[PDB]
Amino acid sequence: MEEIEHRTVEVNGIKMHVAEKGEGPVVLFLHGFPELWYSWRHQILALSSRGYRAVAPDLRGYGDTEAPVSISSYTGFHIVGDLIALIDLLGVDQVFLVAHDWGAIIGWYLCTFHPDRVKAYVCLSVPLLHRDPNIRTVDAMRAMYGDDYYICRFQKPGEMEAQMAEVGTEYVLKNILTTRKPGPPIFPKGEYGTGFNPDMPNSLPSWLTQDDLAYYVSKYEKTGFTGPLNYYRNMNLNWELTAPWSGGKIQVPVKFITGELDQVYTSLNMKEYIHGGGFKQDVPNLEEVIVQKNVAHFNNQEAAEEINNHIYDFIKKF
């Protein structure tokens, strides 16, 4: 940890906090919501110690990275804008890509725009958001789960922030981080309530330390949740703007891994998409699909060793 390097760089007009360790071909790590560069702490150590360059930024709006005020500065294009610039500072043509949750969606947009810059992709939790010409991303979600589906609830500016402020930053993070309950996260009306997790443990699971929780809480208490929430607020805009790539296919080599209890996997018809053939049709070189038994959403922290080894073995083929 204390040999991990933390520098600020200047990318795509913003100041981004980067975490780095190792030499070798670049492995670029993209965290999701509501995490930080920190969520990759184990993958950074492992991969650096096997001759790879491990690079994990705080994304736009997160942690120690600049958080623009306008909702509209959080499209996928802005974020991929940040990463193309960062990769150029890294001085390399191609990277190895590893991403999780929202980082995975950004990862996908990156593989769509610049596949030639990605050698191979280790995607955790969220598979390709297939673009249905007939319906917008969040329209399809609301049609399926109603208005209290967490993503629908994240849409209205300032509202989820206030509800989150009621229960407290530490509560919110502990609430999300400790969830093991599968299926679409559906909030109670008018408030945060028990949010993602009606079954919150007294003690944190063994993959998460009281220190870990505190590092998360220390960053979010300063930044708040707005910047990270703003990604979801651009889901429909991302859908409209990605029209040039409708019906397209992604040729980057992909290894998809998910926890069995992940809400993403147990909702949105994702199993049918993942295994049924639809995911393979969108991504012709989708290699394995690995489903981790008894592991929930945060699989890179919960099952760190397996993830480490799943990455290395995949990226070694190239």
Can you describe this structure?
The chain has one domain. It is 39% helix and 16% strand. Strands 1-2-4-3-5-6-7-8 form an 8-stranded mixed beta sheet, sandwiched between helices. The chain starts with a strand and ends with a helix.
What are the SSEs and their pairings?
Layout: E1 5-11, E2 14-21, E3 26-30, H1 41-48, E4 53-57, H2 76-90, E5 95-100, H3 102-113, E6 118-124, H4 137-145, H5 150-153, H6 159-167, H7 169-177, H8 210-223, H9 226-232, H10 235-241, E7 254-259, H11 270-276, H12 278-282, E8 286-292, H13 299-302, H14 304-316
Parallel strand pairs: 3-4, 3-5, 5-6, 6-7, 7-8
Antiparallel strand pairs: 1-2, 2-4
Family: Belongs to the AB hydrolase superfamily. Epoxide hydrolase family.
Catalytic activity: (24S)-24,25-epoxycucurbitadienol + H2O = (24R)-24,25-dihydroxycucurbitadienol; an epoxide + H2O = an ethanediol
Organism: Vigna radiata
